[PDB]
Amino acid sequence: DKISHKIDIPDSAWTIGIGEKFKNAGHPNVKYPMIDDSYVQGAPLGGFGAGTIGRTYNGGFSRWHLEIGKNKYTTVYANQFSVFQKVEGNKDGVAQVLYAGEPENGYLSSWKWDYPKESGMYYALYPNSWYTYTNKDLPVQLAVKQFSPIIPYNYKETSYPVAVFKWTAYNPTNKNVDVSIMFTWQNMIGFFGKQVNVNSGNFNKIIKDKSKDSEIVAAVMGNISNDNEEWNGEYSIGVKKVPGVDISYKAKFVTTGDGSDLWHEFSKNGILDNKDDETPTKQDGIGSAIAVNFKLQPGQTIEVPFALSWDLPIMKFGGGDKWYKMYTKYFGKNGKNSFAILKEALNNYQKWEKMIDDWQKPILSNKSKPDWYKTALFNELYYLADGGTAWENGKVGERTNNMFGLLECFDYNYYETLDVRFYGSFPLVMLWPDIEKQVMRQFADTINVQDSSEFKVGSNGAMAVKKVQGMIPHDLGSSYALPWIKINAYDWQNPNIWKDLNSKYVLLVYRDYVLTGKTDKEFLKYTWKSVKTALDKLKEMDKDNDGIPDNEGIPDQTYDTWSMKGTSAYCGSLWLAALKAAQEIGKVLKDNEAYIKYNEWYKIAQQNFEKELWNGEYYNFDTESDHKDSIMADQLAGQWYADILRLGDILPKDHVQKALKKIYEFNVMKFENGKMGAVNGMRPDGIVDESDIQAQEVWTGVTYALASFMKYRGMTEEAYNTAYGVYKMTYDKSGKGYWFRTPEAWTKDGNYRASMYMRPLSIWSMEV
Ligand SMILES: O=S1(=O)O[C@@H]2[C@H](CO)[C@@H](O)[C@H](O)[C@@H](O)[C@@H]2O1
Ligand SMILES: [Ca+2]
């Protein structure tokens, strides 16, 4: 490998061999059907709300999130980079698709598949990823850096449906070598959303832009229709000319054929026919190809950028609503703007690389932090773009704001699940705070919505009211229904009786004020009525008059199957913290009566929480369950947020420290030797709590949250040891193969529940 000298991959990048077979992979541990797309994954391409495309470490464009809210795992085999090389003095060259695999649909048999093992590496430090190609039969070594411009505090380029592929080629040999690099792409108009005639009317065009020092050649893959539907728009691929390369292209090859129309050209001399052909297709699938050819002398390096864009301006949800995607603010809504997006990328990618470096540098340069932590911190961020992210720029057919939503996950297809976002929204408040405040305003606006229509609760078959006035919703809808319009899509349980949602809501509001500098009084004023309503409504659920809402021994908080009854450490502590936050907001907004009342409620509740739950070593799980003395990893969730919010001690420092040390000693170190995170419940005899499946699970996002709480309490070693098990399981050779699909949970056997999950974004709470 002579090429990793010529590029700049950070040591904290996650790495795997191209074509590597992973032997330990985990699978779902539930009986019901659940997504398992395998370990062949990579860092995604695409901005927020753009739809994303997962290109895997084997090279294939395989995890398709272009239909907003959906996960479709299928490799589109035509979509590839290929190489040709010919050593000066040899009669023939060699051509090779850079894909460690071969088609499963019978097509493109003429292409040279099966990129060999042990001949290159994949690296990822989101939003960047790289491939290196170090192959005994390719004398010129190649690398590519691929990315989308995902940039904190930037709401423009971060939205773009674009990717850049910056190639580097180096000749370590003593002979001249002819080299070509070819990007192929299928005209994917009709891949989803089109109910009949999926290819019909698709056509490809070639654009040559000859600006001084900025020559671009691109293919635009569109459809003859001007219909404004989710399916219609354009793809584009292209390249920018650099000194010493030439460009060639082929506008139309058939993807539902053997591929030789293209490949016989490429395999001869690495030069395409430059044949333009705008004829629309009927049934056949079609594609385009853009190539560069160059001669490298001994010792020579050259760099050349390609790009990909997708202008699919409309997202449709299953309940019928159609919305424009965010990037249309910058490029237009008519679906005929792929070239403009591509051109912007090819002309500005160096500036985008610097912007990414500038944001990653403070962390990367901090030599106190281990590399593994950096690997996880950056790579968990994949989910912000990959989680079905919806970011609207108007309803189709007809505002100041752009509504936003991130899915909980794909298996549980709910936008912004609040009990989860309490953990998973750290990166948004830290890095894209304007989006975070918009989401919270969305929740504020729902507080007094009432929908008295009844739904059947999935778990027990009881009927319940959809939305109760004064109760925060579980979620802002489903991609299968109507995001932002119809809330509480979740029906497996009744969230109107949950005991955590209203307290978490208030905590999130105050967090969002504190972590953006304690200056945004207008945000506190917008949300204040909803905060007061939320706490007042939750107070009504205190049936024994101890000042604390009572868990009911039935599904009533985020651990939906783990029954809490009476006062719980979890809900009780969140309540205490939410009261303290609201007192503070009352002081800021000069609402005396609120300050007065929430202080009184706090003092009573604090005294009783401590009396009811403090056992001398830790806080009991609850007051009334058979499992009341379980040690819960999340028992002091409210004090964790109180630390972040700078609200001081809700519980005594000594008792918090004892409890955290107990959780480390038990839930971490007695669970598979502390190598897999914090199990949720452990009995005081050191045996995992078997009262419910959730007690026997590690929750990745709970464990990262626990690690930040330990860190803030000076338990540095325990904090990183605790987090390390989650990193190991996710990313390491000894783990279970969950990279770019971190799950909610795993059991002690390492098998998982709910891949591609929002909660582990809580790792960013370790950077507070
Ligand atoms: O009912 S679920 O399967 O439970 C999931 C998690 C627990 O893993 C809950 O916290 C969340 O509120 C639910 O929307 C999910 O659907
Ligand atoms: Ca009570």
mmCIF file of C-alpha atoms and ligand atoms in Angstrom, residues 408 412 414 417 419-420 474 490 492 498 558 560 694 699 744 753 757 759, ligand 1:
data_model
loop_
_atom_site.group_PDB
_atom_site.id
_atom_site.type_symbol
_atom_site.label_atom_id
_atom_site.label_comp_id
_atom_site.label_asym_id
_atom_site.label_seq_id
_atom_site.Cartn_x
_atom_site.Cartn_y
_atom_site.Cartn_z
ATOM 1 C CA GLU A 408 -36.878 6.692 15.851
ATOM 2 C CA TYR A 412 -40.751 1.526 14.611
ATOM 3 C CA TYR A 414 -42.226 7.176 14.124
ATOM 4 C CA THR A 417 -40.231 9.838 19.301
ATOM 5 C CA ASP A 419 -38.969 9.584 24.969
ATOM 6 C CA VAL A 420 -36.109 8.536 22.630
ATOM 7 C CA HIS A 474 -45.110 10.159 21.782
ATOM 8 C CA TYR A 490 -47.467 4.775 17.779
ATOM 9 C CA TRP A 492 -48.578 -0.509 20.464
ATOM 10 C CA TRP A 498 -46.905 7.847 29.983
ATOM 11 C CA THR A 558 -39.923 4.465 27.397
ATOM 12 C CA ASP A 560 -42.539 0.079 27.573
ATOM 13 C CA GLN A 694 -35.884 -4.965 28.516
ATOM 14 C CA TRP A 699 -29.611 0.020 25.467
ATOM 15 C CA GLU A 744 -31.481 0.150 20.261
ATOM 16 C CA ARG A 753 -33.243 -5.349 18.568
ATOM 17 C CA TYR A 757 -31.738 3.568 15.970
ATOM 18 C CA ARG A 759 -31.073 6.693 20.859
HETATM 19 O O1 LIG B 1 -43.029 -0.421 21.493
HETATM 20 S S1 LIG B 1 -41.721 -0.453 20.892
HETATM 21 O O2 LIG B 1 -41.312 -1.641 20.222
HETATM 22 O O3 LIG B 1 -40.698 0.046 21.939
HETATM 23 C C1 LIG B 1 -39.694 0.880 21.288
HETATM 24 C C2 LIG B 1 -38.879 1.649 22.318
HETATM 25 C C3 LIG B 1 -38.233 0.668 23.300
HETATM 26 O O4 LIG B 1 -37.220 -0.102 22.640
HETATM 27 C C4 LIG B 1 -39.735 2.706 22.991
HETATM 28 O O5 LIG B 1 -38.925 3.453 23.913
HETATM 29 C C5 LIG B 1 -40.333 3.649 21.981
HETATM 30 O O6 LIG B 1 -41.165 4.633 22.646
HETATM 31 C C6 LIG B 1 -41.248 2.895 20.988
HETATM 32 O O7 LIG B 1 -41.780 3.775 20.006
HETATM 33 C C7 LIG B 1 -40.552 1.692 20.349
HETATM 34 O O8 LIG B 1 -41.564 0.736 19.900
#
